[PDB]
Each structure stands twice: as structure tokens, then as C-alpha cells.
Amino acid sequence: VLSEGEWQLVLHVWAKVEADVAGHGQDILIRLFKSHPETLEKFDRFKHLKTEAEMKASEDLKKHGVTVLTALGAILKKKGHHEAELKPLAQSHATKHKIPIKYLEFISEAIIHVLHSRHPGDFGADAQGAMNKALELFRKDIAAKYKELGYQG
Ligand code: HEM
């Protein structure tokens, strides 16, 4: 359970992300695909992209980065009370997209790296720890729905 102070650190940096949702979404997905190429293979939509420059040039990738970060921002702003938001996302990711929980750990690492690069003054160690706690809570609650559905592993 995050404390109020931890949530304030999370949402303070997140309000900065929202100034350029699309640039953040591109940077996070590109870092994910470069750091963990098995993730790119899950996207029929993107798996034709073979270089970082091709990834940066893809408008469709930039659009999907916005989709992803808008869903995550709506979850963070619930401060843990996010059951209604996670149901459909766990269901699609487990049963349609076939995304292991581990790959959610990988995207969490990419989010934290990009927030540290773009917002160092608002993303000191206290805020890095709080965001890590918020993304761990996200993964914990998604993993429980995966397990219900027979996909935790
Ligand atoms: C912060 C974590 C993530 C969030 C908030 C998120 C959010 C979303 C949203 C909102 C959609 C569109 C609606 C839906 O299908 O449920 C989507 C689609 C999708 N996501 Fe995620 N996602 C996350 C992580 C991942 C990861 C790690 C992968 C793969 C490694 C992944 C793979 C996909 C795929 C394959 C689609 C369908 C893309 C298409 O063909 O249109 N997601 N995601």
C-alpha cells in the first residue's frame, strides 16, 4: 500500500509526463523493444521495425505510446483504487495479447528510466522508490487476475 506522501511523489512526476505524453510513450516503447527484443515480437503491429530510427519515425508507434500512457495515467490517478481499470487490461493482456507478467516488469523498468532522463529534478530517489512501488502494485494486481484466468505461469 503506498502512503499519501508516496502517491504525491508519483503524481507530481506524472503531471510532468503529461506535458508530452507522445514523446514519453515513444521513448518508453523504444527502450522496451531495444532492451527486450522478445517484447517487440508480441506486436504484429510493430514487428516490421528493425532499427531505432525506424521506430522513432513510426507515427503508429507514437499513437500506441499515447494509448499506453493514457491508460497508465488513469490507473495511477486512482491511487490504488483501480479495480475497474485493471479488469479489461488484464483480460486483454492475458488472453488476447499473451503478455507475460515478466514483460510488465520490463516496461516498468523502461518507464522509470525515461522518467529519470526527462525529469531528474522531480525524480530523485524518493520519487523513484515511490514510482517503483506504484508499478509493483500495478503488476501485483494484474498478476492476481492472470492467476484467476490461468495465465500466471
Ligand atoms: C504499463 C503497461 C501497459 C499498459 C498500461 C498497456 C496498455 C494497453 C492498452 C490501453 C491497449 C489497447 C487496449 C487493449 O488491448 O487492452 C494495449 C494494447 C496492446 N498491448 Fe499493452 N499495455 C502495457 C504493457 C504491454 C506490454 C509490456 C506489452 C508487450 C510486451 C503489451 C502488448 C500489447 C499488445 C500486443 C497490444 C495490442 C496492439 C495492437 O495490435 O493494437 N502491452 N495495451
Swiss-Prot record:
Enzymatic reactions: Fe(III)-heme b-[protein] + nitric oxide + H2O = Fe(II)-heme b-[protein] + nitrite + 2 H(+); H2O2 + AH2 = A + 2 H2O
Described function: Monomeric heme protein which primary function is to store oxygen and facilitate its diffusion within muscle tissues. Reversibly binds oxygen through a pentacoordinated heme iron and enables its timely and efficient release as needed during periods of heightened demand. Depending on the oxidative conditions of tissues and cells, and in addition to its ability to bind oxygen, it also has a nitrite reductase activity whereby it regulates the production of bioactive nitric oxide.
Keywords: Cytoplasm, Heme, Iron, Metal-binding, Muscle protein, Oxidoreductase, Oxygen transport, Phosphoprotein, Transport
Protein name: Myoglobin
Pfam family name, one: Globin
Keyword Oxidoreductase (UniProt): yes
GO cellular component, one term: sarcoplasm
GO biological process: removal of superoxide radicals
Family in the record: Belongs to the globin family.
List of residues binding O2: 64
Subcellular location: Cytoplasm, Sarcoplasm
Phosphoserine PTM sites in chain numbering: 3
A single GO molecular function term of this UniProt record: heme binding
Subunit structure as annotated in this protein's UniProt entry: Monomeric.
Residues binding nitrite, per UniProt: 64
EC number: 1.7.-.-, 1.11.1.-
Organism, as annotated: Physeter macrocephalus
Gene responsible for this protein: MB
PANTHER family assigned: MYOGLOBIN (PTHR47132:SF1)
Binding annotation for heme b: 93
Primary site of residence: cytoplasm
Domain of life: Eukaryota
InterPro entries, per the entry: Globin (IPR000971), Globin-like_sf (IPR009050), Myoglobin (IPR002335)
Domain Globin: 1-147
Sequence positions bearing Phosphothreonine: 67
Root EC class: oxidoreductase
